[PDB]
């Protein structure tokens, strides 16, 4: 009856039943293995930890992300995550009801082929469907026309949709995302005098970003304020009890989104990419696209990201244009919210990919009957 | 008139005049205070011993390294060792001619700021400049392109340079170095049945490291011979008078660089870091970078290091590629030699930081005028 | 078939069956050879007195400790201590059931190598295993996380364990121990007026230490009260009938543990070596280890030692850190009590080194299978 939805991706993964108002299973997609010899006999601990188990004991395990930039790289460790969420967390058998998956646009064809094989061989689910993470955000906001920015952990992509009929040629993908921001914050924090080297402290850096980092309305004047004042310095508590003070790095780290030259990335900024995507569309539809620009993804949870982008677009876009940025609350789970609503729709019962279709034509059916 | 090239690294310090082909003052960077009050005959209360004097009277003095992983933890002692290297060894007042310093990349910003303040006030030199240790290594070889492997006493880093353009995003720093190998040798030799714990005893262990240990072409193959052959055993004489035997402990210490998991570091091997350094760069410059790899630092004097590094990179790198490891003689003094060449250049005269610039813009001038 | 667990440590030696809550055969590990040719009425140990019997006749015998700083020196003398333990004290044939042995961390290979040969040749025990003394301390306390502070008679070491994954690189070993304290107490008492030189007199001083000595938190000030009051002065009668008075020497002797410079040993104090071990751990496991600190060994039931170390650590540690010193009652047998629990465990059975495995691979298996 109710179909499972899993917005599988880098970082946190959300799983839940159809029609639910919020995902009940959120946990980092981390698979780790110990780097020390077992010394205690009768400990009973396993040799692989995922989800919250790895996060609690991250000081020993060598954390590895199965999903990098939106493409699965280690199917051995990747399959464990799927086995864990269905059994240990969701406490439900996947073979009773259909499962819905999500993936980023412009992904290697081999990624989808192996995703299908795992569903129909390892788990044997009666039905399955993979949907673009960009198109799911419209259903969450209850709109049919507009551009989305699902700035996730691994990939940032923009897809303009005008009352349906998603344009394939205007889909822009940028490798800059939240994970690459953490690596930049790792390097820039070295200048102040704090050093983080191993993967265990990489998680610590991520928590610092989620609690202190913010986007300034202006960049050039903001640095001047920190030069002659200390009001922008906020203290933070390390897990071991040490105290660390963040200087001007509070706003420099999120600034790499709008100036990729900080990371050496030649590609245009996040605000320039959306402008490029709009111009690819026809002129007659550009009026509607400017008004409806909804955001998504956890990388857009920084305070002030709404006002900064609007200034960037307004200067770039011609004047007398109703530039509205839609950044509603709960948008961190925007991709999952749309999937739950869309799956519950009665029309979705027609384009499910059943096990019979996969058997008769092999994994290649996912490129024809599914977008 | 001339330029004082000074390389205040860890373990040893090199000082000399610009244009010379070799340093004239090399001594350990060890400063010692008198543990017990007293005076020397024919002299006053020195209150401090720097360099070879400290090792001569190590019994009644404490031993402390002012440099730990390329970080100046204490500045009262750093003022002393600079004072020793200007008046007691070089026998020249620094107030007449400018000086040049070297530092590790990705160092804390507070480290460089205090370097400017001390020298422009305590010594009052007309001009000063700070350069990356890795960058100066390329000048000694006379090349313009290629990665630089600077494995010093405290810090190991790689700085890929292409046609005189640095890649800041591609800089990787490793804290594993020669000093960590010395501490690792103590635990390994403990298993054999020799105990070394005294700070003065630590120097004797380091002398064993520089004369007996070598990097083999294989772990399992050569260690199998060690367990069933006495030819690898080499006898050594301590200054105390006893004679010890070193067997399979000869090869494990210098090869911890390739497998840092022995000490517990999660960071990848030195060959891995060099491989990861190039992979972060663009595709078009990878052919040049692989061909030109320059080895530098004291911990690169182990026999057979060139063959082992070439073998490791060849396996990782794609085939049909001319991999070349450049490990010329006199590579221990590569950093200082490059400084002499750079200082003698007339084009470099427009890069000195004068007192007029320092006074108006404050000590923070080294961040923009200098690298 | 039971599991014999024998401590076989310096000073007192514990031997007992698996599953028991207290050792039965407790006696000093002292063996002595008759200095005098004569033998007495019905006398059976003509080769050498072994165990507490030599204690009752130390005037005629000469006492020799087979264990110095936790390493076997006289293998011929050790063969007697086990033969006396298994036969005249424990009263059972060791060949019937296998025996479990303990050894200090960072021990020479020759100590473990010859240990296997003796057990399988002289006693023909069915199986043998070697367990670190520090690790077994945690089993008695029933915990799986925390550090271990085993301060024995011959060696003092700290081995942090986190969730059953002990860290080899964080093991620290200090040579100063209870035996060195007895020598220091003898030296200070000589200045007082009572001179002790014989091995019998050395034992008497140890008895004085075990009864009168205590740790003062305010050592820097207690000597003012000691020098201005006779209340701290206590009198203990000697066997010869002379009653000596211990004044300021009562608390100065235990202070050598925290101030090793009193004995000329340049190593850090017992409170400092614990912090250094934690400093070498991961950042995320730093908080847990502070809460769980287990004190073990015979040099730990000094009154007030827990308060002094807790106050010392909280000064070096960052504030708002819950520093708890877990000192269970009857900690003199924590090493042996933990051995009984591990031996009785069903899971531990698979880790025993059977005699058949020793034959094929020789004595070299003692490190492949064990720690």
């Amino acid at each position: 009856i109710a179909a499972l939805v899993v917005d599988n991706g880098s970082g946190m993964c959300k799983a839940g039943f159809a029609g639910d108002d919020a995902p009940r299973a959120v946990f980092p997609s981390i698979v780790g293995r110990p780097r020390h010899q077992g010394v205690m006999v009768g400990m009973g601990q396993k040799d692989s930890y995922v989800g919250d188990e790895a996060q609690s004991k991250r000081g020993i395990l060598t954390l590895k992300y199965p999903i990098e930039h939106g493409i699965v790289t280690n199917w051995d460790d990747m399959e464990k995550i799927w086995h864990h969420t269905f059994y240990n967390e969701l406490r439900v058998a996947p073979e009773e009801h259909p499962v819905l998956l999500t993936e980023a646009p412009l992904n290697p064809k081999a990624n989808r082929e192996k995703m299908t094989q795992i569903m129909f061989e390892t788990f044997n689910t009666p039905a399955m469907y993979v949907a673009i993470q960009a198109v799911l955000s419209l259903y969450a906001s209850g709109r049919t026309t507009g551009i989305v920015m699902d700035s996730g952990d691994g990939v940032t992509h923009t897809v303009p949709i005008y009352e349906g009929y998603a344009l394939p040629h205007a889909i822009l993908r940028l490798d800059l995302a939240g994970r690459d921001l953490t690596d930049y914050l790792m390097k820039i924090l070295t200048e102040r005098g704090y050093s983080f080297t191993t993967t265990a402290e990489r998680e610590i850096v991520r928590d610092i970003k989620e609690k202190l980092c913010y986007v300034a309305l202006d960049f050039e004047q903001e640095m001047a304020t920190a030069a002659s004042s200390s009001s922008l310095e906020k203290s933070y508590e390390l897990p071991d009890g040490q105290v660390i003070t963040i200087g001007n790095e509070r706003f420099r780290c999120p600034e790499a989104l709008f100036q990729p030259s900080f990371l050496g990335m030649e590609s245009c900024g996040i605000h320039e990419t959306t402008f490029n995507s709009i111009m690819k569309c026809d002129v007659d539809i550009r009026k509607d696209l400017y008004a409806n620009t909804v955001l998504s993804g956890g990388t857009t949870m920084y305070p002030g990201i709404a006002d900064r982008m609007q200034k960037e677009i307004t200067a770039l876009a011609p004047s007398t244009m109703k530039i509205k940025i839609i950044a509603p609350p709960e948008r961190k789970y925007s991709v999952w919210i749309g999937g739950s609503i869309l799956a519950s729709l009665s029309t979705f019962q027609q384009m499910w990919i059943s096990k019979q279709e996969y058997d008769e034509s092999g994994p290649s059916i996912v490129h024809r009957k599914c977008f | 008139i001339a330029a004082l090239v000074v390389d205040n690294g860890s373990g040893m310090c090199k000082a000399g005049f610009a244009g010379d082909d070799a340093p004239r003052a090399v001594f350990p960077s060890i400063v010692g205070r008198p543990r017990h009050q007293g005076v020397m005959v024919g002299m006053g209360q020195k209150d401090s011993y720097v360099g070879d004097e400290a090792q001569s009277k190590r019994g009644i003095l404490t031993l402390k390294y002012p440099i730990e992983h390329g970080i100046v933890t204490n500045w009262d002692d750093m003022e002393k060792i600079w004072h020793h290297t200007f008046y007691n060894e070089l026998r020249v007042a620094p107030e007449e001619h400018p000086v040049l310093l070297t530092e590790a990349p990705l160092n804390p910003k507070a480290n460089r700021e205090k370097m400017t303040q001390i020298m422009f006030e305590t010594f009052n030199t007309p001009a000063m400049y700070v350069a990356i240790q890795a960058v100066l290594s390329l000048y000694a070889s006379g090349r313009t392109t290629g990665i630089v492997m600077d494995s010093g006493d405290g810090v190991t880093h790689t700085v890929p340079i292409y046609e005189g353009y640095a890649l800041p995003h591609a800089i990787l720093r490793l804290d594993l170095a020669g000093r960590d190998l010395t501490d690792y040798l103590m635990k390994i030799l403990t298993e054999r049945g020799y105990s070394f714990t005294t700070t003065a005893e630590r120097e004797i262990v380091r002398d064993i490291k520089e004369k007996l240990c070598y990097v083999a072409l294989d772990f399992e193959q050569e260690m199998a011979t060690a367990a069933s052959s006495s030819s690898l055993e080499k006898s050594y004489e301590l200054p105390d008078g006893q004679v010890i035997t070193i067997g399979n402990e000869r090869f494990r210490c210098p090869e911890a660089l390739f497998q840092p998991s022995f000490l517990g570091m999660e960071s990848c091997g030195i060959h891995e870091t060099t491989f990861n350094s190039i992979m972060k760069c663009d595709v078009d410059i990878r052919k040049d970078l692989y061909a030109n790899t320059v080895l530098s630092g004291g911990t690169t004097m182990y026999p057979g290091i060139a063959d082992r590094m070439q073998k490791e990179i060849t396996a990782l790198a794609p085939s049909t590629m001319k991999i070349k490891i450049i490990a010329p003689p006199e590579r221990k003094y590569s950093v200082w030699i490059g400084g002499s060449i750079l200082a003698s250049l007339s084009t470099f005269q427009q890069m000195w930081i004068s007192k007029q610039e320092y006074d108006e813009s404050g000590p923070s001038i080294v961040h923009r005028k200098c690298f | 078939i039971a599991a014999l667990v024998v401590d076989n440590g310096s000073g007192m030696c514990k031997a007992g069956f698996a599953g028991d809550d207290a050792p039965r055969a407790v006696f000093p590990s002292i063996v002595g050879r008759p200095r005098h040719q004569g033998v007495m009425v019905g006398m059976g140990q003509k080769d050498s007195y072994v165990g507490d019997e030599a204690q009752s006749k130390r005037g005629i015998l000469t006492l020799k400790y087979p264990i110095e700083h936790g390493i076997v020196t006289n293998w011929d003398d050790m063969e007697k201590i086990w033969h006396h333990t298994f036969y005249n004290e424990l009263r059972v044939a060791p060949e019937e059931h296998p025996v479990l042995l303990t050894e200090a961390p960072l021990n020479p290979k020759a100590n473990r190598e010859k240990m296997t040969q003796i057990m399988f040749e002289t006693f023909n025990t069915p199986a043998m295993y070697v367990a670190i003394q520090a690790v077994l301390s945690l089993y008695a306390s029933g915990r799986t996380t925390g550090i271990v502070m085993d301060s024995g008679d011959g060696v003092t070491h700290t081995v942090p364990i986190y969730e059953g994954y002990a860290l080899p690189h964080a093991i620290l070993r200090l040579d100063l121990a209870g035996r060195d304290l007895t020598d220091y107490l003898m030296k200070i008492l000589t200045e007082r007026g009572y001179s002790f030189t014989t091995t019998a007199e050395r034992e008497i001083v140890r008895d004085i230490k075990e009864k009168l000595c205590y740790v003062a938190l305010d050592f820097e000030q207690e000597m003012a009260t000691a020098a201005s009051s006779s209340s701290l002065e206590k009198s203990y009668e000697l066997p010869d009938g002379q009653v000596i008075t211990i004044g300021n020497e009562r608390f100065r002797c235990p202070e050598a543990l925290f101030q090793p410079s009193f004995l000329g040993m340049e190593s850090c104090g017992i409170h400092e070596t614990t912090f250094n071990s934690i400093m070498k751990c991961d950042v995320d496991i730093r908080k847990d280890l502070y809460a769980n600190t287990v004190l073990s060994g015979g040099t730990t039931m000094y009154p007030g030692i827990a308060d002094r170390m807790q106050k010392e650590i909280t000064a070096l540690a960052p504030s708002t850190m819950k520093i708890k010193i877990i000192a269970p009652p009857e900690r003199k047998y924590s090493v042996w009590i933990g051995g009984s629990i591990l031996a009785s465990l069903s899971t531990f059975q698979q880790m025993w080194i059977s005699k058949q495995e020793y034959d094929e691979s020789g004595p070299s298996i003692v490190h492949r299978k064990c720690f």
Partner: peptide, 7 residues
């Protein structure tokens, strides 16, 4: 250093 490594 000031946090991570022992410096």
């Amino acid at each position: 250093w000031x946090a991570x490594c022992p410096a």
